[PDB]
Design a protein around this nucleic acid. Structure first.
Ligand code: 3QB
Ligand code: K
Ligand code: K
Ligand code: K
Ligand code: K
Ligand code: K
Ligand code: K
Ligand code: K
Ligand code: K
Ligand code: K
Ligand code: K
Ligand code: K
Ligand code: K
Ligand code: MG
Ligand code: MG
Ligand code: MG
Ligand code: MG
Ligand code: MG
Ligand code: MG
Ligand code: MG
Ligand code: MG
Ligand code: MG
Ligand code: MG
Ligand code: MG
Ligand code: MG
Ligand code: MG
Ligand code: MG
Ligand code: MG
Ligand code: MG
Ligand code: MG
Ligand code: MG
Ligand code: MG
Ligand code: MG
Ligand code: MG
Ligand code: MG
Ligand code: MG
Ligand code: MG
Ligand code: MG
Ligand code: MG
Ligand code: MG
Ligand code: MG
Ligand code: MG
Ligand code: MG
Ligand code: MG
Ligand code: MG
Ligand code: MG
Ligand code: MG
Ligand code: MG
Ligand code: MG
Ligand code: MG
Ligand code: MG
Ligand code: MG
Ligand code: MG
Ligand code: MG
Ligand code: MG
Ligand code: MG
Ligand code: MG
Ligand code: MG
Ligand code: ZN
Lengths: 58, 38, 136, 75, 93
RNA sequence: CCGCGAUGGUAGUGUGGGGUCUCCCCAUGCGAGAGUAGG
RNA sequence: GCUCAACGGAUAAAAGGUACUCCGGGGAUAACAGGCUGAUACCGCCCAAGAGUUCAUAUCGACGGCGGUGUUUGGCACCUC
RNA sequence: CCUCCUAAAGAGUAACGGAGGAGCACGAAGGUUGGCUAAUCCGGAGGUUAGUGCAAUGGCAUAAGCCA
RNA sequence: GGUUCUCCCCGAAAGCUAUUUAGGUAGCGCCUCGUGAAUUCAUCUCCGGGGGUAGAGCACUGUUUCGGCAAAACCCGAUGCAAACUGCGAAUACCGGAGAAUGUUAUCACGGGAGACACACGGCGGGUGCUAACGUCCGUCGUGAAGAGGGAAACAACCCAGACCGCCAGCUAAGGUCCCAAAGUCAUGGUUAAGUGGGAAACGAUGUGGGAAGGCCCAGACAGCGUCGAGUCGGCCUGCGCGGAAGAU
């Protein structure tokens, strides 16, 4: 079962509460923070929700 | 001279000419038809 | 000067004027004057334009008005403050969206129709274009 | 001459489809029968629909008139 | 009337608006037993053709890939206020 | 059990971005109503 | 047993004047002037009904349309009690 | 105090915003069983377009309408 | 009005309801401290739900125009319009269920201590006003309030971004790279001649670039057409400019 690397690229300041909750769900804490997560539809949906401020290395 | 925002040919003898960045109507027939855009 | 003969209510919310028009085809006549811009047409403007085009054709052919001013517009008098209830109805408007055929004409040549609608369009606050009936 | 209104009545659906309810639980408050009482659902004097058994709420469209019924599917 | 057409790869609002920005427009061929075929047309070429009134009465040929489909124009969606075509329905003749 | 309907296009719209910002456009996702073929 | 209706109902029981005034406060809030706005006002322009013997445009510009100024009457209550 | 809209398709939601009502009535106009179905136009057509004790909204033929 | 030493952690509100209440106060909401407790809570995915908004539509309730028909009713065809129209109807949002990952329990209850109940601007959806106001009143999100730093000349509320302390290290964001002033007088292909860029509309015009299609034309076009020797005419669409354009140290 593969994993993917997700990096936060923009600030959470001024984003919608749902977007901040999604960053918390991915475990992203600050700009440039990279996390490794399991590649699932649930994880991909979180990436999709905040795709404007994260980058995936898959 | 008629000084107007809308300048146009009023007869067949009217001619549109641009002189020094100004649209003008000159007429060989009728001095009343002379116009400057302004 | 057009106005609903009666209405269920006297005053109406301002609302907004988004979207493209319904009634974008020449449905009755041969030629049409179509709105390309967005805005309000007052009953007075509609009448002024009608008179201009009607005079131009010299009681020849037939003219349709496709728009009707059914929206009442209120105004507050001079030297009254804000609030104290909604103002009094002063005039009626039709909301116009881009594409709305405003007037139609039949039973004249195209050249005379173009001339008549040019004279009408000068009375209107919205940009317009000349249109003709299509097969489809 | 205006300036009046009444208190809002908090009508509407209280328990949506698939929700587990106890007997007595109000499912919908309404004016008249906008929804109708199906299986294991009662209709109060103010047209409130309430559960007569424990179970899951089920909305359904049945009858010749094609009416919205609410039932409880017993657990 | 012969119309050259390409089969569409992308569909929907985004794809369709991109077509029209590139001076093409979407169309559909339907009717008969065969499934509907979504096509792209050149705007200027078809706009010039359909100015002629015979375009709407007569049987047309649409050349798609290397196959000639006989059709009639069934419906046209025009731009609300510009001399432009948004979409055409063609019925198989 | 309870007497219609694709395909395509159009309208709208969640999120992000933009403009000439009373209104729109772009990327992406969702996508009618009406009508058409047909049943 | 309450039009305690000022309807969560100060008392069983209550109107006014003050330019003779007074205190505590407020630019939380008005009068002056500034500011924002520009409906109104004023000025300019577009279309051309027509008037002008003839002739829309010498001159005037009906029905309507678009602006500019900050310039009247106002709106707001941002500064100063 | 009640009804509708504003109110952004759960609830709620302001203005000296837009519109209307209440301060009751009824021992039947309540309970139940049985029976019945309107407006309107010209027996027929039509199908609730009527009715609801009284505003408005949502309901009501299994009628909540209507009679014994 | 004023309220006196220090550091560390968390951190509001300017709302609802009631009030002889409205710049006061009370309960609730939001802060803090303590205690206890469930996969309690959030994000996403999938599943179960109710919608009547946006849009649309015109059977209904009103409104509307044309034609036909005819007691100009009614009816029919054609065309629109609606916050208080709906024979249709989204996106979202909301309720519930299941599953994973992530999150310092982020959740709920009870108890000790509050503060707050003048909000502001900006975005979106609206009422009001003139789709006037740095106007006013709601909903919802953001920021300011209580938030420094960089950008927008200057500029709480906009854009970027959340300052534990030190560094004469490095990479970036918005925004920039001729000089003031850090970094391209960078590369390639176009456009503009107005200092347009670096205010302003209806409307006016052989400005100038691009595109598709027409009419006429060596049976000689377009002014000369009592003439000689190839273009010529004027619509359409579109890029960038021009006039329209007057204010007080
Ligand atoms: C339409 C009037 C508007 C107000 C005028 C002014 C004011 O109050 N002035 C005082 C003055 O009194 C004396 S002059 C006699 C003082 O010397 C002078 O300084 C000053 O205070 C008095 C005239 O009332 N306000 C600021 C606004
Ligand atoms: K319940
Ligand atoms: K009281
Ligand atoms: K006294
Ligand atoms: K003064
Ligand atoms: K002017
Ligand atoms: K003359
Ligand atoms: K003062
Ligand atoms: K309190
Ligand atoms: K506490
Ligand atoms: K707001
Ligand atoms: K903050
Ligand atoms: K300049
Ligand atoms: Mg000179
Ligand atoms: Mg709206
Ligand atoms: Mg209310
Ligand atoms: Mg209500
Ligand atoms: Mg899109
Ligand atoms: Mg579709
Ligand atoms: Mg459909
Ligand atoms: Mg009270
Ligand atoms: Mg009291
Ligand atoms: Mg004093
Ligand atoms: Mg003040
Ligand atoms: Mg003043
Ligand atoms: Mg003049
Ligand atoms: Mg005048
Ligand atoms: Mg003033
Ligand atoms: Mg204020
Ligand atoms: Mg001052
Ligand atoms: Mg000052
Ligand atoms: Mg609601
Ligand atoms: Mg909602
Ligand atoms: Mg609230
Ligand atoms: Mg409130
Ligand atoms: Mg209110
Ligand atoms: Mg903190
Ligand atoms: Mg109360
Ligand atoms: Mg709508
Ligand atoms: Mg509606
Ligand atoms: Mg859930
Ligand atoms: Mg208070
Ligand atoms: Mg307050
Ligand atoms: Mg306030
Ligand atoms: Mg507020
Ligand atoms: Mg707004
Ligand atoms: Mg304000
Ligand atoms: Mg404002
Ligand atoms: Mg403060
Ligand atoms: Mg700051
Ligand atoms: Mg700064
Ligand atoms: Mg600075
Ligand atoms: Mg660098
Ligand atoms: Mg950058
Ligand atoms: Mg330098
Ligand atoms: Mg260079
Ligand atoms: Mg300049
Ligand atoms: Mg200009
Ligand atoms: Zn002349």
């Amino acid at each position: 079962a593969k994993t993917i690397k997700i990096t936060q690229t923009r600030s959470a300041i001024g984003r919608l509460p749902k977007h901040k909750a999604t960053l918390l769900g991915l475990g992203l804490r600050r700009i440039g923070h990279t996390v490794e997560r399991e590649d699932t539809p649930a994880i991909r949906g979180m990436i999709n929700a905040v795709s404007f401020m994260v980058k995936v290395e898959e | 001279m008629k000084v107007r925002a809308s300048v146009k040919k009023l007869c067949r003898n009217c001619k549109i000419v641009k002189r020094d960045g100004v649209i003008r109507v000159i007429c060989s027939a009728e001095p009343k038809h002379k116009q400057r855009q302004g | 000067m057009l106005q609903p003969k009666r209405t269920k209510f006297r005053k109406m919310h301002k609302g907004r004027n988004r979207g493209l028009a319904q009634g974008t085809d020449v449905s009755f006549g041969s030629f049409g004057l179509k709105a390309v811009g967005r805005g309000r047409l007052t009953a007075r403007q509609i009448e002024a334009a009608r008179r201009a085009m009607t005079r131009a054709v010299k009681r020849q052919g037939k003219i349709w008005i496709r728009v009707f001013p059914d929206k009442p517009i209120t105004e507050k008098p001079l030297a009254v403050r804000m609030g104290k209830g909604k103002g009094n109805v002063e005039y009626w408007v039709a909301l116009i969206q881009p594409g709305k055929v405003l007037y139609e004409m039949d039973g004249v040549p195209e050249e005379l129709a173009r001339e008549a609608f040019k004279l009408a369009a000068a009375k209107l606050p919205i940009k317009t274009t000349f249109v003709t009936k299509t097969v489809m | 001459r205006n300036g009046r209104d009444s208190e809002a009545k908090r009508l509407g659906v209280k328990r949506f489809g698939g929700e587990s309810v106890l007997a007595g639980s109000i499912i919908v408050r309404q004016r008249g029968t906008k929804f109708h009482a199906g299986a294991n659902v009662g209709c109060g004097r103010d047209h409130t629909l309430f559960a007569k058994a424990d179970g899951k709420v089920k909305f359904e469209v049945k009858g010749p008139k094609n009416r919205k019924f609410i039932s409880i599917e017993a657990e | 009337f012969t119309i050259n057409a390409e089969v569409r790869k992308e569909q929907g609002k985004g794809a369709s608006r991109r077509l029209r920005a590139a001076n093409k427009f979407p169309a559909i061929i339907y009717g008969g037993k065969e499934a509907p075929l979504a096509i792209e047309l050149d705007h200027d070429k078809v706009m010039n053709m359909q100015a002629k009134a015979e375009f709407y009465s007569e049987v047309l040929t649409i050349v798609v890939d290397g196959k000639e489909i006989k059709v009639k124009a069934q419906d046209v969606q025009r731009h609300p206020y510009k001399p432009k075509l948004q979409h055409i329905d063609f019925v198989r003749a």
